[PDB]
């Protein structure tokens, strides 16, 4: 039945592979990447008229009938995204009179206008001189002086946040303004009678910081600031030391953009780091067939490749398949051997991790590392000298990365400090990098493939961690992939792989939960609204990925023979395309719970391929 389906899926995956041996599907986010890119261009005085057009077409193609833009396809209108999209469009050329402009603007005003937007949005506008700097929460360059164990020192923030902060402290220190041409000004964002609904810090605002902030803005107006220029340099240096091979910073857009702006403010426009940084942007840009152009929030080549291999190996391809060998060789050259920021909490730990993107040595992550090592373990490469070596290094690095509670975070160890979540500036997404169920599950499944079990202390501690984190209804929260189906799928398949008895009460309780959310069509679906509204838990339109996830949960838990199992397989067999792939008009990736969502192009093909390969084995 599914046999031919698997074959078609397999041959399709191989057609997607690049000549070098890796896989790389684009990463989908939301309109702000290009809206900010447009602003960035203006600031840097490098506007390409042609590029602006491809961006106009994109922003429009993304707008909905109501004239708004969302975070995820089918999601509620987002104020922030819509304001930035609007500002970009007005700058590009469109007048306030036009149909798209009107609808957008009316929604904006109905929300309290400019004053209801996140810090970033107001800051971007402040940069361009449309909003007053004194109303934007300050981040001083002096933050650079706080040592390692001191509260609020930069190493208490998550990887992503850290660089953004540093880069921004320089920008905030100078409060520069790049006036927009009179034609593109947006005073209309203030024109609203509706009371502004202000969003506070992610963990509730303390009056202390509120006071501290006001002090900072006051201090900002003094004629002299002792040790300021020295703090700026610390920030600049911190930046120059960590620039990525591709010219970015962390392989993500925020710090990369701010870094570039900071360098411009410092007259370093003709310095190598700037040059490289600017031209590196082109690699993250994508040309769309309808004449548009988008910008990727980040890139997933290592992730894609690693998962692809696992999918194909499970599908049935032999360990020495010449195609999977190219993949294997490519992966080996990707291993990081130098220390990174992580080394600040683990100085005696030997480097051996892997990053998400192509060239990002200072920020390897547990998720990627775990998958890669595991995927390597399943292969049969020519020089297993380097294969044995790489695995051991990756393995040991992961072990040494375990946190206090028994689980794992993405980039750092015990990045649990609660302090940062209360700052006035931090009103968008996660600011810290604490351990999570999914990263931990992936680590567990990695060790699992290596024969290790519940007997090993490392694993036990992790399992203890998972049992305590399990939701009342028996589900597991999805930190990096769209929710409970993601987490629960990852956890259960992990637990099985490490030797635990699938017969257990809590596991069965989860297994049952999966069956009770199966949609009529036979597949599973979970909308991004499940982070805001707990009613949407396990609810949403069926998707290839989310279906494949719940499938793996059941297959691992023994319920492979079950009805819900065969029913799901039908869904996949039927919904498959003639080329072998699947479609997925929905995002099943999570950036920041409730604030940022991602569309992992490859998930729709990779996961079902992996799930079916696993189903076939249960025979």
Residues of the chain with CATH 1.50.10.20: 1-26+299-619, 27-298
Contact 293, 34 (CB under 8 A): yes
Pick left, alpha or beta for residue 484 (phi over 0 → left; psi -120 to 50 → alpha; otherwise beta): alpha
- Point out which residues pair with 599 in neighbouring strands: 28
* Among 88, 54, 37, 72, CA closest to 296: 37
Tokens 């509670």 -> residue: 405
Residue 393 and residue 391: Cα distance in Å, rounded? 5
Residue 245 is encoded by which pair of tokens?
A: 């091979």
Judging by beta carbons within 10 Å of its beta carbon (0-12, 13-18, 19+), is residue 382 exposed, middle or buried? exposed
DSSP secondary structure code for residue 77 in this structure: B
Tokens of 411: 């980039």
Resolution (A): 2.8
Q: Two tokens at 514?
A: 């999966």
Residue/partner pairs of 466-473 with CB below 8 Å, 24 or more apart: 466/407, 466/437, 466/440, 466/441, 466/491, 466/494, 466/495, 467/506, 469/407, 469/437, 470/506, 470/510, 473/513, 473/537
Pick the CATH number of 1-26+299-619 from 3.30.70.100, 1.50.10.20, 3.40.50.12140, 1.10.340.70: 1.50.10.20
Q: Could you count the other beta carbons within 10 Å of the beta carbon of residue 460? A: 14
What's the CATH code, domain 27-298? 1.50.10.20
Q: Which residues contact 237 (CB under 8 A, 6 or more apart)?
A: none
- Rounded to whole angstroms, the Cα distance separating 588 from 544 reads 10
State the Cα torsion 309-313-317-323 to the nearest 10°: 20
Which of 489, 479, 371 shows the shortest CA–CA distance to 434? Answer: 479
Apex CA 257: angle with CA 255 and CA 263, to 5°?
Answer: 95
User: Is there a contact between 191 and 112 (Cβ–Cβ < 8 Å)?
Assistant: no
**What span, in angstroms and rounded, lies between the C-alpha atoms of 299 and 132?**
34
- Unique residue bearing structure tokens 């391809």: 317
Instruction: Assess contact for 295 and 26: CB atoms under 8 A.
Output: no
Question: Going by C-beta distance under 8 Å and a sequence separation of 6 or more, which residues neighbour residue 451?
Answer: none
528 close to 594: Cβ distance less than 8 angstroms: no
Distance CA 202, CA 428 (A): 7
Strand, helix or coil for residue 250: coil
The H helix count followed by the E strand count for the chain is 22, 5
Given a contact cutoff of 8 angstroms between Cβ atoms, the answer to whether 271 and 570 are in contact is no
**Element holding 422 (H helix, E strand):** none
- The residues with which 365 forms a beta bridge, in sequence order, are 354
Listed in sequence order, the residues at least 6 apart from 216 whose beta carbon sits closer than 8 Å to its beta carbon are 138, 140
How is residue 10 annotated by DSSP? H
CB-based contacts of 389, cutoff 8 Å, min separation 6: none
């Amino acid at each position: 039945a599914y046999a031919r389906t698997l074959d078609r899926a397999v041959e399709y995956l191989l057609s997607c592979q690049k000549d070098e041996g890796y896989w790389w599907g684009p990463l989908l986010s939301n309109v702000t990447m290009e809206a900010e890119y447009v602003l960035l261009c203006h600031i840097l005085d490098r506007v390409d008229r042609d590029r602006m057009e491809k961006i106009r077409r994109y922003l429009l193609h993304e707008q909905r009938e109501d004239g708004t833009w969302a975070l995820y396809p089918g999601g509620p209108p987002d104020l922030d995204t819509t304001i930035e999209a609007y500002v970009a469009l007005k700058y590009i050329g469109m007048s306030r009179d036009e149909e798209p402009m009107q609808k957008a603007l009316r929604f904006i005003q109905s929300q309290g206008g400019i004053e209801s937007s996140r810090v970033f949005t107001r800051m971007w506008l402040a940069l361009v001189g449309e909003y007053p700097w004194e109303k934007v929460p300050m981040v001083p360059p002096e933050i650079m002086f706080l040592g390692k164990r001191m509260p609020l020192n930069i190493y208490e923030f998550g990887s992503w946040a850290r660089a953004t902060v540093v880069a921004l402290s320089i920008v905030m220190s100078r409060q520069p303004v790049f006036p927009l041409p009179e034609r593109a000004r947006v005073p209309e964002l203030y024109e609203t009678d509706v009371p502004p609904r202000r969003r506070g810090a992610k963990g509730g605002g303390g009056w202390i910081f509120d006071a501290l902030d006001r002090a900072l803005h006051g201090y900002q107006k003094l004629s002299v600031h002792p040790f300021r220029r020295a703090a700026e340099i610390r920030a600049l240096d911190w930046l120059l030391e960590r620039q990525a091979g591709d010219g970015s910073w962390g392989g993500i857009q925020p710090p990369w953009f701010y870094a570039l702006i900071a360098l411009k403010i410092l007259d370093m426009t003709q310095h190598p780091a700037f040059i490289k940084g600017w031209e590196g942007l082109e690699l993250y840009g994508v040309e769309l067939d309808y004449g548009g152009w988008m910008f990727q929030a980040s890139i997933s080549p290592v992730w894609d490749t690693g998962l692809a291999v696992l999918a194909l190996r499970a599908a049935g391809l032999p360990a020495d398949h010449d195609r999977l060998v190219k993949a294997g060789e490519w992966l080996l050259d990707r291993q990081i051997t130098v220390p990174g920021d992580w080394a600040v909490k683990r100085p005696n730990l030997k480097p051996g991790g892997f990053a998400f993107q192509f060239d990002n040595v200072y920020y390897p992550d547990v998720c990627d590392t775990a998958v890669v090592v595991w995927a390597l373990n399943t292969l049969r490469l020519p020089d297993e000298r380097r294969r044995r070596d790489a695995m051991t290094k990756g393995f040991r690095w992961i072990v040494g990365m375990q946190s206090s509670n028994g689980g794992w975070g993405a980039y750092d160890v015990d990045n649990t400090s609660d302090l940062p979540n209360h700052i006035p500036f931090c009103d968008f997404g996660e600011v810290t990098d604490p351990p999570s169920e999914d990263v931990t599950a992936h680590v567990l499944e990695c060790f699992g493939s290596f024969g290790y079990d519940d007997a090993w202390k490392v694993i036990r501690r992790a399992v203890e961690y998972l049992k305590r984190e399990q939701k009342p209804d028996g589900s597991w929260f999805g930190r990096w992939g769209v929710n409970y189906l993601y987490g629960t799928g990852a956890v259960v398949s992990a637990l099985k792989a490490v030797g635990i008895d699938t017969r257990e009460p809590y596991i069965q309780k989860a297994l049952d939960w999966v069956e009770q959310h199966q949609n009529p069509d036979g597949g599973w679906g979970e909308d991004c609204r499940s982070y805001e509204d707990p009613a949407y838990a396990g609810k949403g339109a069926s998707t290839p990925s989310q279906t494949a996830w719940a499938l793996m949960a059941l297959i691992a838990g023994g319920r492979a023979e079950s009805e819900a199992a065969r029913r799901g397989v039908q869904y996949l067999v039927e919904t498959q395309r003639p080329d072998g792939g699947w479609d997925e008009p929905y995002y099943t990736g999570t950036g920041f719970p409730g604030d940022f969502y991602l569309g992992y192009t490859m998930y729709r093909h990779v996961f079902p391929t992996l799930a079916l390969g696993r189903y076939k084995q249960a025979i």
